[PDB]
Ligand binder design. Structure first.
Ligand SMILES: O=P(O)(O)O[C@H]1[C@@H](OP(=O)(O)O)[C@@H](OP(=O)(O)O)[C@@H](OP(=O)(O)O)[C@@H](OP(=O)(O)O)[C@H]1OP(=O)(O)O
Lengths: 101, 223, 272, 442, 852, 46
RNA sequence: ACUCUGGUUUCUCUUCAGAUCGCAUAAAUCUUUCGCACUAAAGAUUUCCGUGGAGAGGAACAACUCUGAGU
């Protein structure tokens, strides 16, 4: 890290059918913390990446936008949001109701 | 020199010959006054001896300077690329008397006023590598004992000439190890048709009186 | 012939809703800063490596550090060091932080942020001040009404009858910011193979906490994409001769229609 | 001693070419001529309190802003701006006394060396040889002859006609401060005005460099018109009438060959052109010894070499799918014929240089024995004498370019290196293998 | 003329005739923050003016971005002025000398160049992002430049479709934007008449992405065309503000009736726009024809089958027609060149307006002496020749005329900077295809061709053989100061002359660019920021000097500064011991340095005004303030020379005989500096005493100036000095969810986040900080990388701060590749500067002193 | 895999998203086709 | 509001296309490049994968909704 950062600063100043690409050929080993642990693309608390599980993606949210939404929304807006969340939970339960074995 | 050969584009340093053997910290450093003074000295030396009889070319020669901007004075005499570094500029660096280093003390005070770091010149290493390659290639039908004797003679000459500098030049040590490995591989091929999986050094390094090849090698071949 | 695919706005909205799982749900392309095709090309051409991107063999052989010897403009003892210039800071400003940046494609500066408050509940009206938007603080030499500024009885706003919101209004305003196939409303039916459904995932930055194998796979996919992009020689002008249509014109070929399974079995038997 | 006004005229710090003012004590050149300007600051700081404006040509005390008046300083102005009088530009043949430079070295104008900045040997030799011709030297020694040339404003080739004039004027300065002139400005202009060709870094072919320089001077002397009657075109370009023909076919019978011989498919035509340089091709070395010729260098007489261009001597060209058997004839001879013997060729796997010597008498010669019969008596003067020879000694890859020039005024044919001026015996001039030769028709 | 031009609505002969008129030319610059929409707005203007040039559906037709660097980098690089004839709201056709300046904070030099060749500024504010750092900076600079201002609001489509605020909230955001703009204006304005409001007719509401430019008057005229018999001016006077409309009385009531009547503007302007944008972008297929018929626009089947965004642009262009409102607002606010001639002459023209030549220039008469002025010097396509660009303040420059191009320092006493040239073949100011012309009447913008030989940065072309009592237009005063330095050398030293010629050309090209060669032989070139220098290199190595050049690591131009008072009295003597001066150094009172640097305390004023402004504001003694000598290094310099000689010992006349030499020496010393060969700021050097000989041969001349410089250096070194570094204010605009990451990024660069705040109406916050420029290299890349490309930042040198350590500290070691710690910065900075500059590595307090 | 197999669906054989591999192999086959066709045509001559 | 050349679909052929001909992406040969080239880059070439432009011909069903035009 720190010694690696100093060494990197100094450096800047001065057959066999391999099936799976070995991890040696990978990138993104950055000494600096700012370019290693960067804030993800939180789409204003209303979007996320593609492909990943929507429930998992929403569960692992940063909750920063949620706090502002719950501390800024109006009481009538809060009631409407609660009704919408109840409807979504009922839809999920209906999906959960169709699952049996 | 500027009057008799002006270079307003500061192109004098475009051709100054530095030693690629020594690291960038110890080399001439190619300064402004340094490069110009070196070129001036080379010209003044060349302008003295007439070119009709014999001329010292400015390319194959080497002018190295030591000054406020160049702390190390590098020389290459008798095939031994040296680099004298005075203690006045080598301060905050304790003296660890390795084999490669040659502490050049004073005359009257008898104190170490400098340290003449030494290393085998790249020309000598190239000559040794060429000799080893020729010996391996021109082995042919000669007995393994003859090839071993030739390799031993070459190694003895190389080690006895560059007695100390053979250690500092890590490239020279790597070349010696590679040459020994090549000679051992040639001997093994001459003995075994296939590739012998770790043939014992007793076959190679045993003295001639005991019947071995009598190889004298400077490798780290642990018994 | 299936050459034009122009659907209505609600149809495209329903298609985007049914396919939003595979879409990256981005707004501004600025989120891929120093990670675009131009950035990858500049990194490859400069013999550098973007940490989130691939790396290839240098385009031009680079001499060693010792090839230069403490030049007056290369003396380490004169450069003031505050932060180490990483490969990103060089691939971003190639002309200022890279000596001899031969064939270094520049990258576009930050486009303005797409501040689009995406909808979350259909019940809410179309043009409503969402809580996400920061509130506007409500704190004009208006002439007095004592004058005779009277408008004719027929003067009315142009869209007095037209409402300020609609059922498809919010959805329509949503499709403005969308992946390209959703953004457009009239397109040409491309080939099945020519529609990569996973390219946008690889193009984006790798997901956080992925294993080394996944990161290496993403880097290799980015390398393949950059190789296919840098070698994008435009196609040549052919005479437009159809081999299939030519064989159809040949009297030694018949035409019929059969299931893909039966045709595949027949092709396997023919190959055997 | 430190004043060298050969390089570019720019400021020390300002790096601007406007309102420059060189320092007569500090050596370097600054900008401005008053307070708050770089010149005043440089004079105050370095105590160098004497500056001359490179454009106003006046010596002024920059710290005090008081122009000085001393005629004893006219040497500096003369060295900076060499101007040749109306009569002094014609007394070049009356060069009796040796011109001693301000340094400790006697010399003669015209016999001066151009510093070999990297591999500038070819260009330096070509320039020092072209400057020998009194026509071109006189034309370039009068700035009025080219200042009013109507060149396009957005053209860079006009620098070649302007920079070469400065070099020619400096090389003929009777009271130059130094004993040599640096071709840095002229060579840099040539490099810029040639599209990365014939640069100062890598040496080039002397014949190619001479041809390119002559073409650039001919296209730059004319201005805003197709005025072919340029100074270079009038002083070193002549007329040759190539009565050339072609052969029908090598693989055809008598009937098919005669058909093309009679159907104008193998006809002889006159394609008379302007031969600025006559590439007299030397014969390849026999590559075999003989009883005679104790020296193994195959000699060759100039008359036999130059007889190829005569009407009788036919030459064959191996054009694509044709046997172009031609024959040349010199219609009109230029006042200063320039001959460049192509002593270097390309082999099937390399590029060899023919070492055959050209036994060329350097006293008197006449081309009337090879001229065209139509106007043989039209050319009253034909007794041409060689004026300058440029020999490229050494191996083709690593080779030196030396110039053996016959100086006027005196009779000594001095041989000049890049920066060394020696004396060459006239018999020894015909010994070194010449590459480019320029002869005066007298 | 036998020229060739693209087809246009107007006529080239008509354009020339309009140019011949002196009171119908609009000299405007479209100043605006980064990516506000200025270039696209000019593109819309061109598309209306040039029927052939049309915008592609996806890629906007950037007809104002000619340079390749601006073409690909995205951000505007330089100002591409356009002079085109466009109609107005009433119907009269004007011509507009527009100049589309870039918005980048680093590229503020082009904006400064544009204002000196224009009479008014059209500020551009993005509706979604409101005022930004560049917008505020441009407003301050323009108002300080004493030019008319007309703020316009663009990117309303962002509010109407992206942000989706309700029309009342949209009006609230617009009103807040206008109030903020007016408040910023009043902070620096002088005359209360400089107010901006849609009611005042100095505001335009546009959307460059869809050509939705309009104003109160123009949109009321749209009603008039739709309805008829409506007083557009009086009605538009009631169309904006808090007043509500009452349909029952058919009148607009100041007090809002019915308890549900929105504002007049929202009711009439916002509502329809909303309705039409919602129909086009959300319900096109269903209710597109009915809405089009109601609005009156007819579109063919092909035109209504476009994509949503191009179809919206087409519908808006049909609905609003031409950009009449913008032209009407510009004519109303931005005066004619004859009207604005006197302010320009008083402000930028030197020699005084009341002068005879000043009066002639103020008359703005084409049949007068030629006293033109060229601000920017543009480069030809080939990159060989340069085409100076300026507007004729008087006379009529014509092709083939002989001119006397007075340089940037062609003073009256010393005309040595003059260069009599022959201008010829000048074109008109078109953007992408210039149009030639024979003459140039007084008021139009002329792109001369041939006067570029002496035109380094700025020049004023005059008339030779006449106007012998003339002055040179005052040199440009830029908004911010360049602090970054970058040494450059060719990879192959053979091509050094080519590189230096290219460097001279690029110095001429960029106005604020500073180039020099130091005693160490480095080719240092200055620059405002980072992208600025990146563009400089991308032009130097690929356009002017096609060779490859090696650029060193960027640095920050440090400045000297004294902390404590003078340690002792320094007695410096001139050579031959004829004179013995003595100066005592003392740091300047806080605020006085920034007051002098802002030209507030102008030494150009008389003794009374300067004495009053020093005794009152600075609280200086009424006798001490009456003995000022000079203004340090420059005319507006952070150093003050005070004649503190006691009259009992020093004769006033004898000191005056050396006063000029002393002032020149003090200026040279403050320009040079004793510590790191850098400008000395925030000091007050006072001559405690002096000995002066009688004869000018022995006293003064070439001896006082070096003694003065030595005394100044000794005084500035004896007092405990301290190096200073530039601190660049950074205004990062990031989403509130990412402001924490913005604070985290600025933590690792020795910079504090001065203020965080959300944008009114926008979810993205606007964090403001002040990161020192020395460690700010690459900060933008880190900020936009640690936030996954969701934050952008700019920079501008706000002020200077003292280095944390001490420069004259010999007890601190350094490292070749290890960043020195916080306390070891000043000594390291001084040593590395003296090494890079090649000066002596040691500067002791007894270096230039008399005794050593 | 690493994208789909997240949440309730862990590691297993049920991943049926094969368009990418299908596209890659279709491109490889389209590239390979001319060489194999030329070889087969050369084989069956006269 | 009167009238008017003007229908689309689909099949085939020729010719042109450096426009992201295609919001996709392969193959082969030579050349230069360090090896000692799936695991490698560069330059070129060629064939496929299949397009757009225009023209020409053909058979299905629209005949003026439409729009441009002749008011
Ligand atoms: O190496 P990983 O990417 O973690 O994946 C390995 C393995 O790969 P290796 O052959 O390199 O060990 C296979 O995955 P692939 O990389 O080959 O696709 C395997 O799955 P398959 O045999 O079905 O391909 C399984 O991967 P997964 O866990 O995704 O099924 C396994 O993973 P672990 O090594 O983590 O057990």
């Amino acid at each position: 890290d720190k010694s690696k950062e100093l060494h990197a600063i100094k450096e800047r100043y001065l057959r066999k059918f391999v099936f799976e690409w070995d991890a040696s050929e990978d990138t993104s080993i950055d000494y600096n913390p700012l370019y290693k642990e960067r804030h993800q693309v939180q789409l204003l608390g209303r979007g996320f990446i593609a492909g990943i599980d929507l429930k998992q993606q929403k569960r692992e949210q940063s909750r920063f936008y949620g706090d502002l939404m719950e501390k800024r929304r109006t009481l009538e807006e809060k009631e409407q949001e609660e009704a919408r969340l109840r409807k979504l939970r009922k839809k999920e339960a209906k999906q959960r109701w169709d699952d049996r074995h | 020199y500027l009057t008799e050969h002006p270079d307003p584009n500061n192109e004098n340093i475009v051709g100054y010959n530095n030693k690629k053997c020594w690291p960038r910290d110890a080399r001439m450093r190619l300064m402004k006054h340094d490069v110009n003074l070196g070129r001036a000295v080379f010209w003044d030396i060349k302008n003295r001896l007439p070119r009709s009889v014999t001329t010292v070319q400015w390319e194959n020669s080497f002018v190295s300077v030591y000054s406020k901007d160049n702390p190390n004075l590098l020389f290459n005499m008798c095939g031994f690329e040296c680099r004298i570094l005075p203690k006045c500029r080598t301060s905050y660096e304790e003296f660890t008397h390795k084999d490669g280093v040659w502490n050049l003390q004073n005359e009257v005070t008898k104190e170490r006023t400098a340290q003449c770091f030494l290393r085998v010149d790249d020309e000598s290493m190239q000559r040794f590598h060429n000799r080893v390659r020729q010996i391996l290639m021109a082995s042919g039908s000669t007995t393994f004992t003859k090839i071993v004797n030739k390799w031993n003679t070459a190694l003895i000459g190389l080690m006895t000439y560059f007695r100390e500098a053979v250690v500092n030049t890590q490239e020279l040590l790597d070349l010696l190890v590679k040459c020994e490995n090549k000679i051992q591989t040639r001997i093994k091929i001459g003995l075994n048709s296939k590739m012998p999986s770790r043939f014992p050094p007793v076959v190679f390094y045993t003295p001639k009186e005991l019947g071995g090849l009598g190889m004298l090698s400077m490798g780290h071949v642990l018994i | 012939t299936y050459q034009r695919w122009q659907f209505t706005l609600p149809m495209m909205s329903t298609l985007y809703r049914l396919a939003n799982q595979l879409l990256t749900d981005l707004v501004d392309d600025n989120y891929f800063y120093l990670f675009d095709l131009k950035a990858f090309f500049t990194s490859k051409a400069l013999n550098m490596a973007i940490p989130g991107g691939p790396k290839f063999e240098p385009l031009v052989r680079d001499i060693n550090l010792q090839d230069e010897d403490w030049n007056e403009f290369n003396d380490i003892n004169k450069i003031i060091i505050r932060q180490p210039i990483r490969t990103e800071y060089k691939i971003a400003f190639p002309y200022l932080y890279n000596n001899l940046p031969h064939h270094v494609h520049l990258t576009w500066y930050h486009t303005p942020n797409v501040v689009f408050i995406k909808t979350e509940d259909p019940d809410l009206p179309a043009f409503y001040f969402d809580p996400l938007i920061n509130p506007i603080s409500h704190r004009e030499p208006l002439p007095d009404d004592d004058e005779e500024f009277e408008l004719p009885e027929f003067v009315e706003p142009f869209l007095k009858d037209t409402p300020l919101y609609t059922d498809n209004t919010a959805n329509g305003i949503a499709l403005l910011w969308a992946p390209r196939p959703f953004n457009l409303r009239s397109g040409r039916t491309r080939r099945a193979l020519d529609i990569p459904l996973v390219k946008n995932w690889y193009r984006e930055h790798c997901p956080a906490g992925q294993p080394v194998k996944v990161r290496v796979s993403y880097q290799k996919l980015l390398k393949y994409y950059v190789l296919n992009a840098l070698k994008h020689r435009p196609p040549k002008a052919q005479k437009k001769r159809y081999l299939f249509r030519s064989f159809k014109a040949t009297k030694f070929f018949q035409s019929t229609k059969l299931d893909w399974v039966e045709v595949g079995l027949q092709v396997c038997r023919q190959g055997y | 001693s430190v004043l060298d006004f050969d390089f570019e005229k720019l400021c020390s710090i300002s790096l601007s070419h406007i309102n420059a003012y060189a320092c007569l004590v500090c050596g370097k050149y600054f900008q401005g001529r008053g307070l708050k300007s770089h010149a005043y600051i440089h004079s105050v700081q370095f105590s160098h309190h004497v500056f001359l404006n490179l454009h106003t040509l006046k010596f002024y005390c920059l710290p005090d802003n008081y122009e000085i008046i001393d005629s004893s300083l006219e040497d500096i102005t003369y060295v900076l701006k060499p101007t040749f009088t109306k009569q002094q530009i014609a007394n070049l043949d009356k060069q009796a006394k040796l011109s001693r430079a301000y340094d400790g070295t006697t010399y003669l104008p015209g016999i001066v060396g151009l510093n070999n900045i990297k591999a500038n040997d070819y260009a330096n030799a070509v320039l020092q040889a072209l400057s020998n011709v009194p026509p071109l030297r006189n034309y370039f020694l009068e700035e009025d002859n080219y200042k009013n040339i109507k060149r396009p404003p957005g053209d860079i080739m006009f620098l070649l006609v302007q920079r070469f004039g400065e070099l020619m004027r400096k090389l003929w300065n009777p009271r130059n401060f130094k004993a040599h002139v640096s071709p840095h400005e002229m060579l840099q202009a040539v490099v810029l005005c040639s599209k990365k060709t014939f640069q100062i870094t890598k040496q080039g072919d002397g014949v190619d460099f001479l041809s390119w320089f002559l073409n650039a001077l001919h296209s730059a002397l004319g201005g805003t018109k197709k005025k072919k009657k340029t100074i270079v075109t009038d002083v070193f370009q002549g007329s040759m009438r190539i009565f050339t023909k072609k052969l029908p076919h090598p693989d055809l019978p008598a009937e098919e060959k005669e058909q093309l011989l009679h159907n104008d498919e193998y006809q002889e035509t006159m394609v008379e052109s302007t031969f600025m340089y006559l590439t007299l091709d030397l014969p390849t070395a026999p590559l075999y010894k003989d009883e005679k010729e104790q020296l193994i260098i195959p000699q060759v007489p100039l008359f036999n070499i130059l007889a190829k261009f005569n009407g009788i001597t036919e030459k064959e060209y191996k054009t694509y799918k044709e046997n172009f058997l031609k024959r040349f004839q010199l219609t009109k001879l230029p006042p200063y014929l320039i001959f460049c013997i192509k002593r270097f060729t390309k082999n099937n796997f390399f590029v060899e240089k023919n070492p055959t010597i050209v036994n060329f008498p350097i006293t008197n010669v006449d081309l009337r024995e090879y001229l065209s019969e139509e106007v043989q008596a039209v050319h009253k003067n034909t007794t041409y004498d060689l004026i300058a020879n440029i020999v490229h000694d050494g191996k083709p890859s690593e080779g030196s370019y030396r110039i053996h020039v016959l100086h006027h005024g005196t009779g000594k044919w001095y041989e000049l290196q890049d920066l060394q001026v020696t004396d060459i015996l006239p018999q020894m001039i015909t010994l070194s293998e010449a590459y480019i030769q320029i002869w005066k028709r007298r | 003329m036998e020229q060739t031009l693209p087809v246009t609505v107007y006529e080239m002969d008509f354009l020339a005739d309009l140019m011949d008129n002196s009171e119908l030319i609009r000299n405007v610059t479209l100043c605006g923050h980064l990516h506000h929409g200025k270039t696209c707005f000019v593109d819309c203007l061109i598309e209306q003016t040039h029927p052939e040039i049309r915008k592609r559906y996806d890629q906007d037709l950037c007809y104002t971005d000619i340079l390749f660097t601006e073409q690909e980098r995205g951000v505007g690089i330089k100002s591409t002025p356009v002079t085109v004839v466009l109609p107005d709201t009433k119907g009269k056709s004007y011509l507009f000398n527009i100049m589309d300046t870039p918005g980048h904070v680093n590229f503020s030099d082009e904006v400064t160049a544009g204002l000196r060749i224009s009479d008014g500024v059209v500020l551009f504010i993005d509706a979604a992002e409101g005022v930004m750092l560049n917008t505020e900076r441009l407003i301050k600079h323009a108002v300080q430049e004493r030019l008319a201002v007309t703020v316009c609001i663009n990117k309303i489509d962002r509010l109407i479709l992206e942000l989706k605020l309700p029309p009342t909230d949209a009006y609230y955001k617009l009103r807040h934007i206008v109030d903020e703009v007016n408040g910023l204006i009043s902070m620096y304005s002088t005359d209360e008449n400089l107010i901006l409001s849609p009611l005042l007719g100095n505001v335009c509401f546009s959307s460059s992405q869809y050509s939705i430019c309009f104003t109160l008057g123009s949109f009321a005229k749209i009603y008039a065309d739709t309805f008829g018999d409506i007083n557009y001016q009086e009605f538009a006077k009631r169309l904006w503000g808090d007043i509500y409309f009452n349909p029952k009385t058919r009148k607009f009531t100041k007090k809002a009736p019915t308890s549900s009547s929105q504002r007049s503007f929202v009711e009439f302007i916002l509502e329809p726009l909303y309705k039409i944008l919602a129909q086009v972008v959300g319900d096109v297929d269903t209710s597109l024809p009915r809405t089009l018929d109601e609005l009156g626009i007819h579109l063919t089947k092909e035109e209504l089958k476009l994509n949503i965004r191009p179809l919206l642009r087409l519908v808006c262009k049909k609905f609003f027609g031409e950009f009449t409102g913008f032209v009407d607002m510009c004519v109303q606010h931005i005066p004619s060149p004859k009207v604005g001639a006197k302010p320009k002459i008083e402000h930028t023209y030197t020699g005084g307006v009341d002068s005879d030549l000043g009066e002639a220039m103020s008359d703005c008469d084409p049949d007068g002496p030629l006293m033109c002025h060229t601000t920017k010097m543009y480069s030809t396509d080939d990159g060989v020749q340069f085409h100076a660009f300026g507007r004729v303040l008087s006379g009529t420059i014509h092709a083939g005329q002989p001119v006397k191009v007075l340089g940037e320092n062609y003073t009256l006493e010393d005309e040595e900077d003059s260069q009599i040239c022959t201008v010829g073949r000048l074109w008109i100011s078109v953007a992408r295809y210039h149009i030639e012309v024979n003459r140039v009447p007084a008021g139009n913008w002329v792109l001369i061709e041939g006067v570029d030989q002496p035109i380094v940065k700025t020049a004023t072309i005059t008339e030779p053989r006449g106007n012998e009592e003339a002055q040179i237009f005052r040199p440009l005063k830029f908004n911010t100061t360049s602090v970054i330095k970058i040494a450059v050398e060719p990879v192959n030293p053979s091509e050094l002359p080519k590189m230096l010629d290219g460097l001279r050309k690029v110095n001429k090209s960029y106005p604020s660019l500073t180039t020099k060669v130091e005693e160490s032989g480095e080719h240092v070139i200055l620059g405002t920021g980072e992208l600025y220098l990146d563009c400089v290199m991308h032009d130097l190595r690929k356009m002017y000097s096609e060779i490859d050049i090696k650029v060193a690591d960027p640095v920050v131009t440090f400045c000297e500064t004294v902390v404590e008072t003078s340690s002792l009295k320094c007695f410096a003597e001139t050579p031959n011991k004829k004179n013995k001066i003595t100066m005592i150094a003392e740091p300047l009172e806080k605020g006085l340095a920034e007051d002098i640097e802002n030209e507030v305390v102008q030494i150009t004023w008389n003794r009374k005004k300067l004495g009053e402004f020093f005794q009152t504001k600075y609280d200086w003694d009424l006798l001490a303030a009456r003995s000022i000598w000079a203004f340090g290094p420059d005319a507006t310099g952070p150093n003050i020379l005070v004649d503190d000689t006691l009259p009992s010992e020093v004769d006033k006349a004898l000191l005056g005989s050396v006063k000029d030499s002393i002032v020149q020496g003090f200026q040279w010393g403050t320009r040079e500096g004793p510590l790191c060969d850098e400008l000395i700021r925030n000091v007050k050097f006072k001559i405690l005493d002096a000995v002066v000989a009688q004869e000018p041969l022995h006293r003064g001349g070439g001896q006082i100036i070096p003694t003065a410089r030595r005394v100044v250096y000794s005084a500035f070194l004896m007092a405990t000095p301290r190096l200073m570094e530039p601190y660049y204010f950074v205004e990062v605009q990031a989403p509130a969810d990412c402001v924490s990451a913005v604070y985290t990024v600025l933590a690792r660069r020795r910079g504090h986040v001065t203020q965080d705040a959300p944008i009114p109406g926008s979810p993205l916050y606007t964090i403001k900080a002040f990161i020192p420029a020395i460690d700010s290299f690459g900060f933008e890349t880190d900020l936009r990388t640690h936030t996954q490309g969701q934050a952008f930042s700019l920079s501008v040198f706000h002020h200077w701060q003292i280095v944390p350590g001490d420069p004259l500290d010999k007890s601190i070691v350094i490292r070749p590749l290890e960043p020195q710690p916080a306390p070891h910065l000043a000594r390291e900075f001084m040593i590395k500067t003296r090494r890079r500059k090649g000066l002596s590595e040691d500067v002791s307090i007894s270096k230039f002193f008399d005794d050593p | 895999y690493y994208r789909f197999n997240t949440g309730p669906v862990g590691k297993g054989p049920g991943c049926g998203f094969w368009a990418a591999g299908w596209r890659v192999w279709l491109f490889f086959m389209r590239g390979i086709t001319p060489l194999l066709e030329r070889w087969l045509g050369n084989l069956l001559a006269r």
